[PDB]
Every structure is written in structure tokens, then in C-alpha cells.
């Protein structure tokens, strides 16, 4: 979700950070995120994710 992009960072909390995808704080690397509404969203709800 768009609101959860802030959770993809070292030392974060939330459902994504805690239960799905966790980053170290000794993390060297780059986080990239971009909107994909035109691709991953369809009428009636895309429930594949």
C-alpha cells in the first residue's frame, strides 16, 4: 500500500515491518518505490496481492 512505503526502512514498526518484510539497521543499499495504480489496480478490486 502507499501508506506503508514509509515502513520499508531500518528501525520501523507496523504490519509490513513486523510481519512481512524487515530491514536491518546495518543495511547498506537503496529502497525504491513508485506508484503502480495503472498496473496493479483493476475495477472491482485486485485481490492477487
Amino acid at each position: 500500500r502507499g501508506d506503508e512505503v514509509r515502513q520499508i526502512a531500518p528501525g520501523q514498526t507496523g504490519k509490513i515491518a513486523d510481519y512481512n518484510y524487515k530491514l536491518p539497521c546495518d543495511f547498506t543499499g537503496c529502497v525504491i518505490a513508485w506508484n503502480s495504480n495503472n498496473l496493479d489496480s483493476k475495477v472491482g478490486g485486485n485481490y492477487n496481492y
Binding site: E4, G11, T13, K15
Partner: protein, 49 residues
Amino acid sequence: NRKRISNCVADYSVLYNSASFSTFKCYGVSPTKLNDLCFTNVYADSFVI
């Protein structure tokens, strides 16, 4: 609106089901330690902007 919070357990995993927060920034404390702490005099200041 300022509201006092006292004598309760701050699980804050009940907010994962429904609430999605655009911004969540913590000062003076890491978000990962909030489950392992107790808070002395807690006030919630609520408004709309």
C-alpha cells in the same frame, strides 16, 4: 482536544486490522522499542488539518 490515557495496555496491534497511517514519526524513542516500555503520563492531542 487533549485526552489523558492511563491504566491500560498499549498493544497497538489492533490498529493493524483497520487503521492505516500516512505518517508515523516517533521522537525520543525508537518505534521498535514501543512494545518493551512503559509510559509515565500519556496525552493524546487530536485535531484535523
